[PDB]
């Protein structure tokens, strides 16, 4: 339900790299090696192909970022119906 606020933007998980590292495709047509904060790492399980919010790192904000929130099925369905995001971004 919460939306990106600032430099944050959506993203689609592509492949997990191990040791809490994911490979997320963002809305600006860039692939980023993203790091999962440990606070939500322990309680929220993330799997390839999900809509998430990613904030790029302050330095070298082109290939690194942090994942802050995961969108459930109802939230992504509501977003698709509202029209803030399209279907081809999710499906690739």
């Amino acid at each position: 339900v919460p939306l990106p606020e600032g430099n944050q933007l959506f993203g689609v998980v592509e492949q997990a790299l191990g040791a809490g590292w994911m490979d997320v495709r963002c809305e600006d047509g860039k692939i980023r090696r993203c790091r999962i904060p440990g606070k939500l790492r322990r309680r929220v399980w993330i799997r390839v192909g999900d809509l998430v919010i990613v904030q790029p790192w302050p330095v070298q904000s082109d290939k690194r970022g942090d994942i802050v929130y995961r969108y459930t099925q109802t939230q992504v369905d509501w977003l698709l119906r509202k029209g803030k995001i399209t279907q081809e971004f999710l499906t690739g």
Partner: protein, 595 residues
């Protein structure tokens, strides 16, 4: 006991401000400086004896005395950047001399000087230079205008009359009534215009006697000072000296100043209290900022005079702040309360992310800061001193995240051995200079050169777009495989060797091996040119068909660079080709769908 009145000279660039003072002193200073412009304010004392020698029988026309001990002249830059120096000179001095060239008329600096004089209610008399520019004028060494006028013809006199009439009319729409010194009798609302010649000393005596005489008419009671009271003066500048440390040059005008007296000076953040250690005095008839002769140390000085004070802990002194003598703690508190009623005329705005600039005085730093701020350039730090090692470290720290803002601009300073070695090792650029514009323009042009070099090598990396169509003609096919030799006409874009071609479905037909319009070897083909391509990996039929349209494979980074960086070198055919290529490629990646 009457103190020497303080006279401030104001005017525009190249209007003979320094030359008049040089002629009065009979010394050459105007040729010393670089660029012909004086960027430092100074105070000079003129003894009354040379004043009397310069003058003559004219002193007997006015019923007064020459009991004035002397004169205290202050020079002032006329450049646009040094506004604060002009303001300080206008506020501090008791009398002003505006020097305006007759030929050029009026300049914005003259208007600003008049505005400052009106704001600080300083009476003044107008001077006129460049008299020799009028044709048919004879030159004689040091004669008054009254003696010179009879030596000229009617044409020069009438031209002079017209020019001064125009000047008086100008002052009139500036709301000021003007009349010639020998052509007016009122001396409370009417000014006086003295036509002078700096290069040949014409009319200097009239101006000198007028300055001597007008002092006691408007206000003379302000010129009486007790010779035993506490010292009271103001700061003129703050500069570094070899062997003495941070010293300040001040003009004492109240009381008497002795050595070891405690003084109160308004610092940047709060008042500072220190004990005087060294009192230094310039030689008579010598510019204070030009130490031609050796300074004479002096135990005590009496108002009014310009002296250099060397005391500990003066590195945070504010230019223009007053100095008050205080021998007792209650006097110290009263001086602190007096200082608390003082405003900082100029404050620098630092953005914490900017360049590092260092000068030798506070006024030069203010001028440089204003000139940089006029061009929208942030300033990380401004202070007084030579370029040290930590400055290079700070510059490297700023450069780490901003290539164009890590640089040092030194204005009349020195670079240490360790600092220059570290700068050479870590490749940090330093621009040293003595002239404000000659120093700023160098930085601007270096920034422009770096900017152009940023994209000079970027062009070679990207690949131009291109769309072509095979001839439906059998003739153009000259070899089928290894290599495939077939003619082509260009629809849009530019063909280059070593560029991959793809179809709508994106099959790798290979890489163009060679292009030839004839038996001769070619390099590239532009719009409306036919060329036979010899390509590898392409075979007629299964891989390519006659009459089929071929597209150049494009890199998305190259497309972004073309649409954002190299947007100047894009024309109709190129943009049409790139747009339709994006439309075609909008099949798998939504990036081309959104273009």
């Amino acid at each position: 006991r009457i103190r020497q009145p303080i006279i401030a000279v104001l005017g525009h660039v190249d209007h003979g401000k320094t030359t008049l003072l040089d002629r009065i002193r009979k010394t050459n200073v105007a040729a010393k400086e670089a660029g012909g412009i004086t960027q430092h304010i100074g105070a000079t004392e003129v003894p009354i004896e040379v004043v009397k020698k310069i003058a003559g029988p004219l002193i007997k026309l006015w019923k007064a005395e020459i009991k004035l001990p002397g004169l205290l002249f202050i020079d002032t830059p006329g450049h646009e950047a040094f506004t604060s120096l002009r303001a300080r000179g206008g506020s501090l001095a008791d009398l002003a001399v505006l020097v305006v060239d007759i030929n050029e008329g009026f300049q914005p600096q003259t208007i600003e000087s008049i505005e400052i004089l009106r704001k600080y209610r300083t009476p003044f008399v107008v001077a006129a230079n460049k008299i020799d520019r009028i044709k048919g004028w004879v030159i004689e060494e040091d004669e008054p205008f009254l003696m010179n006028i009879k030596k000229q013809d009617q044409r020069a006199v009438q031209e002079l009359e017209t020019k001064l009439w125009e000047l008086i009319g100008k002052f009139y729409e500036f709301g000021f009534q003007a009349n010639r010194f020998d052509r007016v009798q009122n001396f409370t609302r009417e000014l006086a215009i003295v036509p002078i010649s700096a290069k040949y000393g014409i009319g200097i005596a009239e101006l000198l006697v007028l300055i001597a005489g007008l002092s006691q008419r408007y206000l003379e009671e302000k010129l009486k000072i007790e010779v035993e009271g506490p010292a009271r003066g103001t700061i003129l500048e703050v500069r570094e000296e070899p062997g003495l440390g941070h010293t300040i040059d001040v003009i004492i005008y109240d009381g008497t100043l002795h050595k070891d007296d405690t003084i109160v000076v308004g610092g940047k953040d709060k008042a500072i209290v220190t004990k005087i250690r060294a009192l230094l005095k310039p030689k008579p008839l010598d510019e204070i900022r030009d130490p031609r002769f050796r300074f004479d140390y002096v135990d005590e000085v009496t108002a009014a005079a310009g002296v250099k004070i060397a005391a500990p802990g003066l590195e945070e002194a504010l230019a223009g702040s007053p100095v008050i003598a205080a021998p007792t703690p209650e006097d110290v508190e009263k001086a602190k309360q007096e200082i608390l009623e003082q405003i900082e005329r100029v404050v620098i705005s630092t953005d914490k992310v900017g360049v590092i600039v260092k000068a030798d005085t506070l006024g030069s730093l203010e001028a440089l800061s204003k000139e940089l701020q006029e061009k929208e350039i942030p300033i990380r730090k401004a202070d007084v001193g030579n370029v040290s090692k930590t400055d290079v470290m700070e510059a490297l720290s700023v450069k780490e995240e901003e290539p164009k803002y890590g640089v040092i601009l030194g204005f009349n300073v020195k670079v240490n051995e360790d600092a220059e070695e570290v700068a050479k090792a870590k490749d940090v650029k330093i621009f040293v200079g003595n002239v404000i514009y000659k120093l700023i323009e160098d930085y601007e042009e270096w920034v422009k050169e770096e900017e152009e070099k940023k994209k000079r090598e970027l062009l070679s990396k990207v690949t131009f777009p291109g769309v072509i169509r095979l001839y439906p003609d059998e003739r153009y096919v000259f070899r089928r495989s290894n290599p495939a030799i077939v003619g082509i006409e260009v629809i849009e874009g530019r063909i280059k060797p070593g560029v991959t071609l793809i179809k709508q479905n994106g099959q790798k037909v290979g890489v163009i091996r060679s292009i030839k319009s004839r038996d001769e070897f070619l390099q590239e083909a532009k719009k409306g040119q036919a060329v036979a391509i010899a390509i590898e990996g392409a075979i007629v039929g299964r891989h390519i068909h006659p009459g089929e349209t071929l597209y150049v494979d494009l890199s998305r980074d190259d497309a972004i660079t073309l649409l954002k960086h190299l947007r100047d070198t894009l024309e109709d055919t190129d943009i049409k080709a790139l747009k339709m290529i994006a439309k075609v490629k909008a099949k798998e990646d939504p990036f081309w769908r959104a273009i």
